[PDB]
Design an enzyme around this catalytic site. Structure first.
Site, PDB file in Angstrom:
ATOM      1  N   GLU D   4      74.246  19.847  59.038  1.00 42.12           N
ATOM      2  CA  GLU D   4      75.193  20.877  59.412  1.00 42.12           C
ATOM      3  C   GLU D   4      74.452  21.752  60.409  1.00 42.12           C
ATOM      4  O   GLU D   4      74.985  22.114  61.452  1.00 42.12           O
ATOM      5  CB  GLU D   4      75.634  21.690  58.197  1.00 42.12           C
ATOM      6  CG  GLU D   4      76.824  21.109  57.451  1.00 42.12           C
ATOM      7  CD  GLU D   4      77.399  22.078  56.430  1.00 42.12           C
ATOM      8  OE1 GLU D   4      76.745  23.109  56.149  1.00 42.12           O
ATOM      9  OE2 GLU D   4      78.502  21.808  55.907  1.00 42.12           O
ATOM     10  N   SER D  24      81.402  25.990  52.554  1.00 41.67           N
ATOM     11  CA  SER D  24      82.305  24.914  52.946  1.00 41.67           C
ATOM     12  C   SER D  24      83.466  24.806  51.959  1.00 41.67           C
ATOM     13  O   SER D  24      84.403  24.032  52.169  1.00 41.67           O
ATOM     14  CB  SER D  24      81.550  23.583  53.031  1.00 41.67           C
ATOM     15  OG  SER D  24      80.450  23.670  53.922  1.00 41.67           O
ATOM     16  N   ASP D  33      83.792  22.107  57.191  1.00 39.05           N
ATOM     17  CA  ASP D  33      82.366  22.364  57.144  1.00 39.05           C
ATOM     18  C   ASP D  33      81.942  23.168  58.387  1.00 39.05           C
ATOM     19  O   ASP D  33      81.091  24.052  58.301  1.00 39.05           O
ATOM     20  CB  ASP D  33      81.581  21.057  57.002  1.00 39.05           C
ATOM     21  CG  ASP D  33      81.764  20.402  55.629  1.00 39.05           C
ATOM     22  OD1 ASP D  33      82.173  21.096  54.667  1.00 39.05           O
ATOM     23  OD2 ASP D  33      81.490  19.186  55.507  1.00 39.05           O
ATOM     24  N   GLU D  46      85.003  18.272  59.504  1.00 39.15           N
ATOM     25  CA  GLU D  46      84.394  17.940  58.221  1.00 39.15           C
ATOM     26  C   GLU D  46      83.142  17.119  58.470  1.00 39.15           C
ATOM     27  O   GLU D  46      83.195  16.061  59.099  1.00 39.15           O
ATOM     28  CB  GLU D  46      85.364  17.197  57.309  1.00 39.15           C
ATOM     29  CG  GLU D  46      86.111  18.106  56.341  1.00 39.15           C
ATOM     30  CD  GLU D  46      85.252  18.569  55.170  1.00 39.15           C
ATOM     31  OE1 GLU D  46      84.288  17.852  54.809  1.00 39.15           O
ATOM     32  OE2 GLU D  46      85.553  19.646  54.607  1.00 39.15           O
TER      33      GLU D  46
END
Lengths: 122, 125, 122, 125
Positions: D4, D24, D33, D46
């Site tokens: 991420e 998230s 996310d 996502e």
DNA sequence: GGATCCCTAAGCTCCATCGA
DNA sequence: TCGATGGAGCTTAGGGATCC
DNA sequence: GGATCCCTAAGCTCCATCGA
DNA sequence: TCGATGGAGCTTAGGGATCC
């Protein structure tokens, strides 16, 4: 990386308590690659190796080292390893200034100190 | 590891040039957790964080340090971070010994030095 | 922090897909406290609360927000929450410039938009 | 979490203004996310990292996204990081369905978009 | 060669043992 | 031997191998 | 009040089940 | 009920409690 280890070795032989630094760049503060001492002498070291000459160093690279060295209480040295040749040591004072940076060419390597000169120099 | 980070900063904040020894032990030699200099004072530092006293230290761990410190040219210290207290610096000479190891307990802890007193222990004199 | 949550609420009521940002300052890049949209309108938000007025904002605080807002494709807004009073919204354009910074005093709060004005404004 | 972080950077590097949605899912709402805009293109993302295909996704997880994306004003994507490959962006429309969930497998993966093609899908036209 | 990466070994604080 | 579903660990780091 | 902090709940990738 | 020794987990985050 595979070099630092044995340089520490060369260093422990010369009677230097050597250590490596865990994550050179990391923090907003400067870092050498090795910091070694022996009671009378202290050393900040930028460890370099090259297939051939000359060795180039950005003003900012040297700047960092000298800052740490100075503020810590040690001596700015660059360790240069050339293939099959033994480590020579160059104090920053010794580096050839360029148009705006630094370097070590054929005409400078000669002056480098074998690790022992560095110790018994004090 | 969170505090080797933390402490390290406290040292810089304290005008010390500190570094984390690459592998507090991965090297084929005796090593401290941290090494700091500042021109007049030099520290071989073993870094510990306990949740509560006492803190035991292997006599090994200790010689390891003194030997290094005696050899590098630094004062061997134990830095001990206790919860909701500031870091505390202890010269090795200050460590009380158990039967065949050492310790910092409730009798010693109080006498640990804040970091300033460490740097300013140089001005005495 | 306990505020952002319910402001998101106020926001979901106004028909805004709101989200909070995970670690505002974190990266070398700028960050708002909330980013919300509804299809036609997008919003970067600096969330502030105070017991009383005026609200102060460093040039650098606003600078960051506007940069993100601009580069993302949204509108720089400051959400101000005063005790028991409802959230008013101030576009950066609306902020009172000072000697060298920003602020919101009694003579400015009045102009703030209730969350609904902001939506149906487009 | 490591990615991420990673991906997020790749987006900024790509001229996108991206952000990690605070929790998230910790929020009392449907959330992606990551959310990124850049003036012309908006992404509800996502973020998934698998060691090898396939990647299954709960039909829940998906509506969650589309609903949000349909509501915020963003294109719903799945970003999938496979080992020693670059990130790959997949519009939800591209996800093949299992009996009652979805998936990206060896048939779909190849058709994922590098990030540029995502930002430059706007120039078509 | 270069980078990623996978994985195994070790390291640190805590807990519980063991002992007092 | 895969094809999709339902259930647990979560450290840091250095080296050999692997893909490219 | 403010900061640290302790701790519990949840989240993500992987593995193995279960199934094909 | 502590006093010192020998053995395992290791995530992120939000809230209540706690020290100060």
């Amino acid at each position: 990386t595979r070099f630092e280890r044995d340089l520490l070795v060369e260093l422990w032989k010369a009677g230097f308590a050597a250590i490596r630094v865990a994550g050179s760049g990391v923090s907003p503060f400067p870092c050498p690659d090795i910091v070694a001492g022996n009671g009378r002498t202290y050393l900040a070291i930028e460890v370099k190796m090259r297939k051939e000459l000359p060795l180039y160093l950005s003003a900012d690279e040297v700047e960092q080292l000298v800052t740490f060295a100075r503020g810590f209480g040690a001596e700015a040295y660059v360790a240069l390893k050339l293939p099959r040749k033994k480590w020579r040591f160059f104090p920053v004072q010794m580096l050839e200034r360029t148009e705006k940076n630094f370097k070590i060419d054929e005409s400078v390597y000669p002056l480098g100190l074998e690790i022992a000169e560095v110790a018994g120099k004090f």
